[PDB]
């Protein structure tokens, strides 16, 4: 009775938002950018290969200086690299070796890691002693942490597999905001450049636009047919790209509240592990699990290059702040910097 | 290179040496993933052999064991089961005293049928093609005391055999081992345990020595 009425109301609201997003769909992004100049071929080459990890890489993150990057691997290690000279600054031994995410603070004073222990551990790099010690162990999640991103030296947004994203206060150790709207496990995070709102791709084939201060979901994006493993904003902050297990990448517009372009090929039947945009937003770099990364034209949905060179599944990739280099991590325990 | 650059190179060399030593020490270790049902009973196994996941460390005859318990992970296991692709063995604990029971959640399957479905999912997974499974059949005393009253026809209706302890236990073991679709690149080791018995660590030691011999033969190229 009441449940049937609520289901009918939900179906009516879903049809209303579908009709509203259909009414604002006069043209398509492929048709508008059909008369722009295509980029020919992006031939990137491996400059530095970072060796030293002994198990599979699950996460890497760049620093804001575009030189220092941190990597996480299942050997219980968190290596901070100097990408210019290819040498190690720090080797952090983790209490739990089942790391699934890593983050680099914008100030560079801290790094984060987490995984199957359901704990976001924050490490102080710049101590009076020469070691890197654990600052905090944020423990309030039920499931495994999938992604963590730093807002400042005191705030960090974590995505977990217990169908929950959380915002933490590091000094207190408690969580201030609990983002609860999903249905499946949240697998990816992306912070906007202005650091006020973030998107989260989960296992219900949905991406939700959250508000950091308000704590409520603003938009829901339902175009995929499988588990979303990767998410990343456009540099403008008005769009983002998703990478799922149905071998497709999709670009979603925040203001139009729907999907603009699908980055798919018939020769690809394998999922996407990591996505990242270029500095200009023209190139979308997606790391697949057919052992290589594919460079996509973000305005024309055409492949511009292939970053072949990894012997196993490319699990993590990131583009620097200045856009000079792309570092790809994979399950063959190697990090390669492309330029 | 400057003086500070040379000293940074030396620091990186020291870090590399420490990483290599830790990697060799970890490669000489044995990693086990412990799996089972909620009512199958795994805490007695950890007690005999000694949120998030639980790591149990114990040393038996100059071998360092690492036992990982993922039973508290109430998430989609397809998104983290590849983290255990490199593992020496999987320990699957099945109580055979709950063939007559049913799940506390809902009645749509038996407990033994749920254990069989989990075994079929784990054994035939894409990440565990060459990973051996050590099978424990726990609570054999309750199974002996319950097979006299309740027959095994309740769980497996196509049994048609003697209702003794040995034939029923062998039929349960055969039904669990018949779900091994690979049967050519992995082995299933079966033990019958009980609470008042301290012999399970020896069984795990013998099985892991077999797995170590097979892995050394594979690394030598002889398989």
């Amino acid at each position, epitope marked *: 009775s009441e449940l049937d009425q609520l289901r009918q109301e939900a179906e009516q609201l879903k049809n209303q938002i579908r009709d509203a997003r259909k009414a604002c769909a006069d043209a398509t992004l492929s048709q508008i950018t059909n008369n722009i100049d295509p980029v020919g071929r992006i031939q990137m080459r491996t400059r530095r290969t970072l060796r030293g990890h002994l198990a599979k890489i699950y996460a890497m993150h760049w620093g804001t200086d575009s030189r220092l990057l941190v990597s996480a691997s299942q050997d219980g290690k968190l290596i901070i690299w100097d990408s210019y000279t290819t040498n190690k600054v720090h080797a952090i031994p983790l209490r739990s070796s089942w790391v699934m995410t890593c983050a680099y603070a914008p100030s560079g004073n801290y790094v984060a890691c987490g995984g199957l222990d359901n704990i976001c551990s924050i490490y102080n790099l710049k101590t009076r002693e020469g070691n890197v010690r654990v600052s905090r162990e944020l423990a309030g999640h039920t499931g495994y942490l999938s992604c963590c991103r730093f807002l400042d030296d005191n705030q960090i947004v974590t995505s977990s597999g217990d169908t929950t994203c959380a915002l933490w206060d590091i000094e207190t150790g408690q969580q201030t905001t609990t983002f609860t709207g999903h249905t499946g496990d949240v697998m990816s995070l992306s912070l906007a450049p202005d650091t006020r709102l973030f998107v989260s791709g989960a296992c219900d084939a949905s991406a939700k636009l959250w508000d950091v201060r308000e704590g409520m979901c603003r938009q829901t994006f339902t175009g995929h047919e499988s588990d979303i493993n990767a998410i990343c904003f456009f540099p403008n902050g008005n769009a983002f790209a998703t990478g799922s297990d149905d071998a497709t990448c999709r670009l979603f517009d925040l203001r139009a509240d729907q999907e603009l372009m699908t980055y798919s090929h018939d020769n690809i039947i394998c999922g996407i592990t990591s996505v990242s945009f270029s500095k200009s937003g023209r190139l979308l770099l997606a790391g697949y699990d057919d052992f290589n990364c594919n460079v996509w034209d973000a305005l024309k949905a055409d492949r511009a290059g292939v970053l072949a060179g990894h012997d196993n599944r490319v699990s993590c990739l990131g583009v620097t702040d200045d856009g000079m280099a792309v570092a790809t991590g994979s399950w063959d325990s190697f990090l390669k910097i492309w330029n | 290179l400057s003086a500070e650059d040379k000293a940074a190179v*030396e620091r990186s060399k020291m870090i590399d040496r420490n990483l290599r030593e830790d990697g060799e020490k970890a490669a000489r270790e044995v990693k086990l993933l412990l799996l089972g049902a909620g009512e199958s009973g795994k805490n007695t196994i950890v007690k005999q052999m000694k949120t998030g996941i639980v790591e149990t460390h114990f040393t038996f005859k100059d071998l360092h064991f690492k036992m990982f318990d993922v039973g508290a992970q109430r998430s989609e296991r397809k998104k983290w089961i590849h983290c255990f692709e490199g593992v020496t063995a999987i320990i699957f604990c099945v109580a055979l005293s709950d063939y007559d029971l049913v799940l506390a959640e809902d009645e749509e399957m038996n407990r033994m049928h749920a254990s069989m479905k989990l075994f079929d999912s784990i054994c035939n997974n894409k990440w565990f093609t060459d990973t051996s499974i050590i099978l424990f059949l726990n609570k054999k005393d309750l199974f002996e005391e319950k097979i006299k009253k309740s027959p095994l026809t309740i769980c497996y209706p196509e049994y048609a055999g003697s209702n003794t302890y040995e034939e029923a236990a062998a039929y349960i073991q055969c039904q669990f081992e018949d779900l091994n679709k690979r049967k050519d690149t992995k082995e299933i080791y079966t033990h019958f345990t009980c609470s008042t018995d301290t012999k399970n660590v020896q069984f795990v030691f013998d099985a892991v020595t077999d797995v170590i011999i097979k892995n050394n033969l594979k690394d030598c190229g002889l398989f």
Partner: single-chain antibody, 232 residues
Framework: VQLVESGGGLVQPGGSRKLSCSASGFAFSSFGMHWVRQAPEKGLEWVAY????????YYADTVKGRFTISRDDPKNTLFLQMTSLRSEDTAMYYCVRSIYYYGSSPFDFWGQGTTLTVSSSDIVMTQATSSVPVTPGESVSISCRSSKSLLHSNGNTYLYWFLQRPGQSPQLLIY???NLASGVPDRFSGSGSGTAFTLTISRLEAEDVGVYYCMQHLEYPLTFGAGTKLEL
């Protein structure tokens, strides 16, 4: 963090004496160690250096072949064995820690000091100013000049500034050119290009009066400069 060193005293010329430094408060194994001596009226002078892991050992030309530097990592102890002492070795000896990676702050902590008394192709860092009369609340620009260009090809200018208060060990202010050290107030600043440098203080209290030293870390043997005293 404290480096307490003991030993020395009154020794005859031609004798031998061992200086030991005890470290407590930091990871001793990950820090390179230095010995810096200072004559009773003169400035600082580098003596020796032992790297982390004891793989790289360097000596000054004055004490080469006669001084031995060693460390005891499990015991957190640094040793300096001196052989064939002269009257030129009469100095106060400091143990200095220095870590080396990208963005590190070498020469950050200095030990207390041991008074040793003995009975009777290098970059020349020049500080022409000496004993400048300074009133508080003003701005002071201490200048340093180098005989070689300290700007390396990697964009790093290895110029180190130190402040020695009277009766205290010297304290690092600026480690690389325009890099304020930890615990140093923002009034201190540093700038330069190539061989000419300056250290600018915006407004100064009675805390920052002493002898200001200039050091290069471009290449060994790490020559200092004669200090510029600031008196009230």
């Amino acid at each position: 963090v404290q480096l307490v060193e003991s030993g020395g005293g009154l020794v005859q010329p031609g004798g031998s004496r061992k200086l030991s430094c005890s470290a407590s408060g930091f990871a001793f194994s990950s820090f390179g160690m230095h010995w810096v001596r200072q004559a009773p009226e003169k400035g600082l002078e580098w003596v020796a250096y032992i790297s982390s892991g004891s793989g790289t050992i360097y000596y000054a030309d004055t004490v080469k072949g006669r001084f031995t530097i060693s460390r005891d990592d499990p015991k957190n102890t640094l040793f300096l064995q001196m052989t064939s002492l002269r009257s030129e070795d009469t100095a106060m000896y400091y143990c200095v820690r220095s870590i080396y990676y990208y963005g590190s702050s070498p020469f950050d902590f200095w030990g207390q000091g041991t008074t040793l008394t003995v009975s009777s192709s290098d970059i020349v860092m020049t500080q022409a100013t000496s004993s400048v009369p300074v009133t508080p609340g003003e701005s002071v620009s201490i200048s340093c000049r180098s005989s070689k260009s300290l700007l390396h090809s990697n964009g790093n200018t290895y110029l180190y500034w130190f402040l020695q208060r009277p009766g205290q060990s010297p304290q690092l202010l600026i480690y690389r050119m325009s890099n304020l050290a930890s615990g140093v107030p923002d009034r201190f600043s540093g700038s330069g290009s190539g061989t000419a440098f300056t250290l600018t203080i915006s407004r100064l209290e009675a805390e920052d009066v002493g002898v200001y030293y200039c050091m290069q870390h471009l290449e060994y043997p790490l020559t200092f400069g004669a200090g510029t005293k600031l008196e009230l």
